[PDB]
């Protein structure tokens, strides 16, 4: 697999770049493609054998390699730029080609915003079956990603976590949420629970004591 | 116009094999290999296989022995199977047109030579145990610190999509929140409906699930 980071921002009219990495295995022998996954729509070839164009596809987007290292370059950044982007690349032990994870790519239209995080503790009707589900919600975000981590008396928690993908609000922030489900013997066997979501840089986190409710 | 449409069913059971069908328009399909992609719900994209130009139908080997790829130039139609499902097939699945030449591209197949050049609209396949099943709804609160309380409903495990929430019967509109749906572990969907409100005011989620011919109310307590 080929890392690329996760977002990036950029500004209209203004260049932006998309660098995706990997080993001599790959990137530093074999052609890099990039696809363009528009939100809620298909993907589209923007680039093909590391710095072609298919027909159609406008010159301000380039791409470039070195090393171990692909780029994809986006001048004169316009709206319709907002999109997943992907690199993919050969392999030479391997037989399939192998992608990057994708970076979405935000062209900034609106003030940044922070998320507003609320989490609640299982209800007692809950708890009667013997199950117990923390729910995290998340909104009011902008740019529209967020990470999500759970915390039960410090220590992180990864497992029956499941964390939506943001979602457009009607006010075009976004939100998301996140759900832990557990038994209620699990629930009541520790001090407290925390939500902890991280937006550039800065966490919000709230906290759920069992002994408090 | 060049076109590739996916179909199939959207909703499989784990052990069974998943069928897709991919219908090509603008370009007659026996000039050109046509691959299939897929994307997990968060994650990147995985090669399935190639059914080229040539006659040849290349597979990822990590799932080869699960694959089946077939071409069908007399319908314009190329085929993907895939057997033993497990909730880790849940993906969106493409089928694209690779282009014909020798680039230096290794998207198409697994090997040097052509690249992707168009792709279908992708088909959402959901691999879950479960058949219909109205959800359970439960009140939210916090009561474990402002002035101005935040209550919800969580409509825990159903199938399928959707339901539609809604507080007081419709008289509650300002301050509600509800949320996308996630896919748990289990098989079954959950969301969550939030309000915050700023004293003998109470407030009722009506929660409606088509599928099962079910309609929820559930009275939740602002302690």
């Known amino acids: 697999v080929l890392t690329q980071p996760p977002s990036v921002s950029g500004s209209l009219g203004q260049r932006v770049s998309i660098t995706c990495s990997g080993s001599?295995?790959?990137?530093?022998?074999?052609?890099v493609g990039w696809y363009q996954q528009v939100p809620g729509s298909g993907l589209r070839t923007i680039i093909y054998?590391?710095?072609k164009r298919p027909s159609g596809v406008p010159d301000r987007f380039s791409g470039s390699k070195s090393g171990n290292t692909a780029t994809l370059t986006i001048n004169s950044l316009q709206a319709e730029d907002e999109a997943d982007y992907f690199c993919?690349?050969?392999?030479?032990?391997?037989?399939?080609?192998?992608f990057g994870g994708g970076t979405t790519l935000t062209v900034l239209g609106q003030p940044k915003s922070p998320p507003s995080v609320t989490l609640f503790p299982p209800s007692t009707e809950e708890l009667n079956g013997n199950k117990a589900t923390l729910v995290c919600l998340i909104s009011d975000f902008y740019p529209g990603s967020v990470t999500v981590v759970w915390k039960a008396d410090g220590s992180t928690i990864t497992r029956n976590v499941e964390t939506t993908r943001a979602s457009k609000q009607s006010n075009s922030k976004y939100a998301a949420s996140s759900y832990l489900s557990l038994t209620s013997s699990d629930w009541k066997s520790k001090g407290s629970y925390s939500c902890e979501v991280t937006h550039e840089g800065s966490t919000v986190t709230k906290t759920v004591k069992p002994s408090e409710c | 116009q060049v076109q590739l449409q996916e179909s199939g069913p959207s909703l499989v059971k784990p052990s069974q094999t998943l069928s897709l069908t991919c219908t090509v328009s603008?370009?007659?399909?026996?000039?050109?290999?046509v691959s299939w992609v897929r994307q997990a719900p968060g994650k990147t994209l995985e090669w399935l296989g190639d059914?080229?130009?040539?006659?040849?139908?290349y597979y990822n080997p990590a799932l080869k022995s699960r694959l089946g790829i077939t071409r069908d130039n007399s319908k314009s139609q190329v085929s993907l199977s895939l057997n033993t499902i497990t909730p880790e097939d849940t993906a969106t699945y493409y089928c694209?047109?690779?282009?014909?030449?020798?680039?230096?591209?290794?998207?198409?197949?697994?090997?040097?030579?052509?690249?992707?050049?168009?792709w279908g609209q992708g088909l959402l396949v959901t691999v879950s145990s479960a058949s219909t099943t109205a959800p359970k709804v439960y009140p939210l609160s916090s009561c474990c610190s402002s002035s101005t309380v935040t209550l919800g409903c969580l409509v825990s495990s159903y199938m399928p999509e959707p339901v539609t929430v809604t507080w007081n019967s419709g008289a509650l509109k300002s301050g509600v929140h509800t949320f996308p749906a996630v896919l748990q572990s289990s098989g079954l969907y959950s969301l969550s409906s939030m309000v915050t409100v700023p004293g003998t005011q109470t407030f009722t989620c009506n929660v409606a699930h088509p599928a099962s011919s079910t309609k929820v109310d559930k009275a939740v307590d602002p302690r």
């Open positions: 694209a047109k690779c282009s014909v030449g020798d680039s230096g591209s290794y998207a198409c197949t697994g090997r040097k030579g052509e690249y992707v050049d168009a």
């Open positions: 603008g370009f007659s399909l026996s000039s050109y290999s």
């Open positions: 059914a080229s130009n040539g006659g040849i139908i």
């Open positions: 001599s295995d790959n990137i530093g022998i074999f052609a």
């Open positions: 054998g590391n710095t």
């Open positions: 993919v690349c050969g392999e030479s032990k391997s037989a399939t080609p192998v």
